[PDB]
Design a protein around this ligand. Structure first.
Ligand SMILES: C[C@H]1CN(c2cncc3ccccc23)C(=O)[C@@]12CN(S(=O)(=O)CC1(C#N)CC1)Cc1ccc(Cl)cc12
Ligand SMILES: C[C@H]1CN(c2cncc3ccccc23)C(=O)[C@@]12CN(S(=O)(=O)CC1(C#N)CC1)Cc1ccc(Cl)cc12
Ligand SMILES: [Cl-]
Lengths: 305, 306
């Protein structure tokens, strides 16, 4: 029993973190085989960030302008190239700790673990979700750029996020490992903002199933709803629309508890319209939306890596 | 910016997890140098749990009755002994991945990271606190016994908890790495129930200071309180008494924000009386108590967003 925001074990990712320095700018890099991946803004000064021409900044650099440090060992850069907003530094040494890995781009609503890093040294690990507005509610200070987000499946690390920046509201923005930003953001110091966010409905339903699995059933009722009537209510409370794909994804949780998805939707509809009335669900007074159906199944089954 | 329940990177502990099997019972062990530490109840059947005589169960076992598996390699047990509620299996191979470590027994209110494991394989990492009633609100299924709790301040792992059982209310109980239980609990299936739990007051104050550092002050007020008057109010909401030691520990957070501890105590008294009125603090609609003053200093910026 119990239900916590659980992150994947970070060991396989810890063995990939390095420090990348270009001039006076320092940040983190991901060392996989003989390549170090990092945010391309490492080549910018504070002045350059207002309006950078990355190809013009990069052409003026040589391999020896990049200092890469793995623990207390200096790696020698022997090549460099840019792919979207990521810089790829070819180094003289392959990482002996390179795990089996893939680069995957995730969709809004999906969760991943973040290994926060400073000066190439891991400091902590936490779980988060890609919000519908493409930002993440992370915990990052200056020096954290280059920290990565990932999921694990058996022995394979699927890297999905590389940290680039913080927005005025304190939320974060970054790219996939191919350098493509999540959301309408650019790597330049210009006026940028998080758009209006919505609640990940399929995830709230998944967490209500987790609460029923863990003994919390007070919110269940005799009612059901159609998918269209539910979506009309959800739209009014800034919840994402629930699709038939979302209903299908909730199938295994619906089968394990014996509660049909539309039956759980009628419970969520009543919670949206009335509230919790002084009660909590899994120790929370808010409807939690950063646990996917898969996260609930994995935690309530004991899947190992 | 931001504030999350952050765990220590688990790599150093992942390299120590093994599987221990005795008969049909299989659980996790911690392999440090040439010793594997695990819960002593690995030698019990379900029937034995009602009134186990561990000495009598252990004397009937030989070294080759213990199967220890590290990844896909079988370690050879060459000795065994019991220390309190932990079994120590001497193996023929020292763990080449043994990190720099210490065994520390923690106090209620202290936090640590848990590496949940099944069959010697890590499944997840999360942060938790030793509750005032000596239980932990973990997330553990059957098969997780032997999973450990730890802190990694600097490059040294301080192991503080080994998981042994789940109580009727769904909370968890275990030992330090010397096998001494936290709380009045025993590794026996008896009527055991967690005592009434209380809120870790010093930790709630630490989290209010984290909110101020991150730029929020709505909950503050123009009042102060004495330590005694604060405690009289706190205990009416099932909050732990705040001691002068707790006030001292909050010193650096008080200095960084410019808010005296007793002034933040007045804000906490008012939040307890009023609630949040539709507002949240660091994305929470409840007063969070599983972040210590040390956790806040570790995570938050050293510069207040004034
Ligand atoms: C040089 C990076 C560092 N960084 C930060 C990332 N994570 C956490 C950070 C925490 C506090 C400081 C900065 C952080 C940014 O957001 C930077 C610097 N900033 S900034 O200082 O104006 C960002 C802020 C805002 N709004 C003040 C938070 C501009 C910018 C633009 C585009 C790109 Cl791709 C990066 C950046
Ligand atoms: C053999 C261990 C396994 N275990 C568990 C530990 N962590 C998580 C677990 C999750 C679900 C099942 C059991 C878990 C226990 O609590 C056991 C078995 N139990 S029990 O099955 O009655 C525990 C329950 C209750 N109340 C049913 C939850 C008695 C007992 C007594 C003393 C010691 Cl030291 C251990 C144990
Ligand atoms: Cl302590």
């Amino acid at each position: 029993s119990g239900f916590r925001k659980m992150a994947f074990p970070s060991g396989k990712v810890e063995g990939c973190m390095v420090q990348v320095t270009c001039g006076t700018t320092t940040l983190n890099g991901l060392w996989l085989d003989d390549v170090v991946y990092c945010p391309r803004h490492v080549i910018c000064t504070s002045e350059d960030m207002l309006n950078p021409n990355y190809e013009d900044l990069l052409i003026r650099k040589s391999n020896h302008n990049f200092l890469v440090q793995a623990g207390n060992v200096q790696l020698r850069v022997i090549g460099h190239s840019m792919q979207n907003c990521v810089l790829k530094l070819k180094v003289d040494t392959a990482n002996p700790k390179t795990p089996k890995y893939k680069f995957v781009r995730i969709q809004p609503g999906q969760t991943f673990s973040v290994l926060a890093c400073y000066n190439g040294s891991p400091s902590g690990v936490y779980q988060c979700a890609m919000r519908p507005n493409f930002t993440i509610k992370g915990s990052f200070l200056n020096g954290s750029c280059g920290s990565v987000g990932f999921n694990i499946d058996y022995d394979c690390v699927s890297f999905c996020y590389m940290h680039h920046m913080e927005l005025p509201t304190g939320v974060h923005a970054g790219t996939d490992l191919e350098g493509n930003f999540y959301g309408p953001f650019v790597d330049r110091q210009t006026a940028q903002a998080a758009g209006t966010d919505t609640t990940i409905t399929v995830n709230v339903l998944a967490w209500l199933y987790a609460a029923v699995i863990n003994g919390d059933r007070w919110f269940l009722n005799r009612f059901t709803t159609t998918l269209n009537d539910f979506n009309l209510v959800a739209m009014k409370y800034n919840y994402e629309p629930l699709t038939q794909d979302h209903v299908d994804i909730l199938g295994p949780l619906s089968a394990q508890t014996g509660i049909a998805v539309l039956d759980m939707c009628a419970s969520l509809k009543e919670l949206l319209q009335n509230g919790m009335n002084g009660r909590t669900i899994l120790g929370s007074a808010l409807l939690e939306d950063e646990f996917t159906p898969f996260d609930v199944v994995r935690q309530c089954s004991g899947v190992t890596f």
